[PDB]
Scaffold this active site. Sequence first.
Site, mmCIF file in Angstrom:
data_model
loop_
_atom_site.group_PDB
_atom_site.id
_atom_site.type_symbol
_atom_site.label_atom_id
_atom_site.label_comp_id
_atom_site.label_asym_id
_atom_site.label_seq_id
_atom_site.Cartn_x
_atom_site.Cartn_y
_atom_site.Cartn_z
ATOM 1 N N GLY A 21 98.434 -41.810 4.771
ATOM 2 C CA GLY A 21 98.740 -40.541 5.401
ATOM 3 C C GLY A 21 98.137 -39.372 4.645
ATOM 4 N N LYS A 50 100.338 -40.964 -4.384
ATOM 5 C CA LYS A 50 100.125 -39.627 -3.860
ATOM 6 C C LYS A 50 99.242 -38.856 -4.820
ATOM 7 C CE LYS A 50 103.040 -36.200 -1.571
ATOM 8 N NZ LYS A 50 104.512 -36.101 -1.353
ATOM 9 N N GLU A 98 107.331 -46.915 -4.971
ATOM 10 C CA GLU A 98 107.470 -48.177 -4.255
ATOM 11 C C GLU A 98 106.794 -48.124 -2.887
ATOM 12 O OE1 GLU A 98 111.710 -48.332 -4.344
ATOM 13 O OE2 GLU A 98 111.780 -49.823 -5.965
ATOM 14 N N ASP A 147 115.776 -32.692 4.892
ATOM 15 C CA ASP A 147 115.027 -33.135 6.081
ATOM 16 C C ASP A 147 115.298 -34.609 6.344
ATOM 17 O OD1 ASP A 147 113.257 -33.201 8.275
ATOM 18 O OD2 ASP A 147 111.505 -33.535 6.972
ATOM 19 N N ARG A 151 112.290 -40.626 10.505
ATOM 20 C CA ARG A 151 110.907 -40.615 10.041
ATOM 21 C C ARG A 151 110.831 -40.624 8.516
ATOM 22 N NH1 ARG A 151 112.075 -35.805 12.419
ATOM 23 N NH2 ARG A 151 112.510 -34.133 10.912
ATOM 24 N N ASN A 152 111.887 -40.170 7.833
ATOM 25 C CA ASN A 152 111.916 -40.147 6.373
ATOM 26 C C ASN A 152 112.735 -41.292 5.787
ATOM 27 O OD1 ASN A 152 110.179 -37.951 6.038
ATOM 28 N ND2 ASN A 152 111.814 -36.456 6.369
ATOM 29 N N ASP A 165 111.120 -38.988 0.415
ATOM 30 C CA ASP A 165 110.807 -37.561 0.396
ATOM 31 C C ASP A 165 112.018 -36.696 0.038
ATOM 32 O OD1 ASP A 165 108.047 -37.556 0.683
ATOM 33 O OD2 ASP A 165 108.037 -37.217 2.828
HETATM 34 C C1 LIG Z 1 105.311 -39.228 -4.151
HETATM 35 C C2 LIG Z 1 104.937 -40.233 -3.082
HETATM 36 C C3 LIG Z 1 103.947 -41.158 -3.404
HETATM 37 C C4 LIG Z 1 103.572 -42.109 -2.464
HETATM 38 C C5 LIG Z 1 104.197 -42.119 -1.198
HETATM 39 O O1 LIG Z 1 104.006 -42.951 -0.126
HETATM 40 C C6 LIG Z 1 104.829 -42.606 0.897
HETATM 41 C C7 LIG Z 1 104.769 -43.331 2.085
HETATM 42 C C8 LIG Z 1 105.021 -44.714 2.186
HETATM 43 C C9 LIG Z 1 105.454 -45.704 1.279
HETATM 44 N N1 LIG Z 1 105.706 -45.358 -0.071
HETATM 45 N N2 LIG Z 1 105.641 -46.970 1.709
HETATM 46 N N3 LIG Z 1 105.429 -47.296 3.005
HETATM 47 C C10 LIG Z 1 105.004 -46.385 3.902
HETATM 48 O O2 LIG Z 1 104.821 -46.684 5.071
HETATM 49 C C11 LIG Z 1 104.805 -45.052 3.495
HETATM 50 N N4 LIG Z 1 104.403 -43.927 4.158
HETATM 51 N N5 LIG Z 1 104.354 -42.906 3.283
HETATM 52 C C12 LIG Z 1 104.050 -41.646 3.597
HETATM 53 C C13 LIG Z 1 102.935 -40.995 3.101
HETATM 54 C C14 LIG Z 1 102.715 -39.683 3.478
HETATM 55 C C15 LIG Z 1 103.601 -39.030 4.325
HETATM 56 C C16 LIG Z 1 104.727 -39.685 4.811
HETATM 57 C C17 LIG Z 1 104.945 -40.996 4.438
HETATM 58 C C18 LIG Z 1 105.600 -41.515 0.481
HETATM 59 C C19 LIG Z 1 106.655 -40.786 1.293
HETATM 60 C C20 LIG Z 1 105.184 -41.214 -0.855
HETATM 61 C C21 LIG Z 1 105.567 -40.241 -1.824
#
Ligand SMILES: Cc1ccc2oc(-c3c4c(N)n[nH]c(=O)c4nn3-c3ccccc3)c(C)c2c1
Length: 289
Positions: A21, A50, A98, A147, A151-152, A165
Amino acid sequence: LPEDPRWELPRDRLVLGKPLGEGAFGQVVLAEAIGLDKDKPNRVTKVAVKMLKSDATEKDLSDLISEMEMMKMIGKHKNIINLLGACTQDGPLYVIVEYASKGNLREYLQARRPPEEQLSSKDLVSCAYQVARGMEYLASKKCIHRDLAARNVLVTEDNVMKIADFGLARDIHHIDYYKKTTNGRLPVKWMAPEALFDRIYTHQSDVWSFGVLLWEIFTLGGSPYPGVPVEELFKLLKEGHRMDKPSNCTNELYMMMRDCWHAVPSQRPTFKQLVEDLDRIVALTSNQE
Ligand SMILES: Cc1ccc2oc(-c3c4c(N)n[nH]c(=O)c4nn3-c3ccccc3)c(C)c2c1
């Protein structure tokens, strides 16, 4: 960036993979981390990473750092997305958490609607229970999500619900009420009235959002107030409107939603209470339909 050996991972132990994403937060990729546990230095673990975009500002960096630091402080729980490590030295900031292989709860529920096996009523209540358990933990660490929504919530390979988040930096005075999610829905539809109208965020307003999420669970990913724009939502809430009971939902669970939507915040249940009630309801719930 300041060194923190509690969390640092050498970045040659991180094999970056496909995107998960992109947006205002930067971008997230899947990755493999070699030797995360110092015990097993020859094991790879799938993780999500991220990092900042190229045209990202000094404030963008500061928000990512505060998000990482917030996760450090909050500690670990089975039902939240846990920090695993960071790459902070001699390169771009990588925040590692994770990986939940089955995506977010909204998509997961929608893929299991009748025309990927259907979810039993116990699966659905157990989903609610796990989200409530994550929120109970977060609230006990004095964390207000702001939030909370399907979705979260992310689902692991083993169908574990993990709140995502909870550590984002938000300036709530810069919320764009009209800004849609990537799915086309309006986040204001999850806010308590006192958060929506008066910008007052509390544990009690997260409980309001949990009630909406419960509604999302028992509609199998339904969209709250479909077709309702911001201005009309304001009117609905000013009038005391509440969403209808989903079909495939007991009166007891609808009563729980309605209590989460109590007009008076002090009269809503706590997450501790919801965990106890949901635990009782799981035990009594038939996994035969
Ligand atoms: C600090 C940090 C680092 C890595 C991350 O990775 C996600 C994440 C996922 C995840 N960790 N596992 N499985 C998934 O499907 C997934 N989607 N997103 C995602 C990515 C972007 C937007 C909204 C959801 C977050 C929320 C995050 C946060």
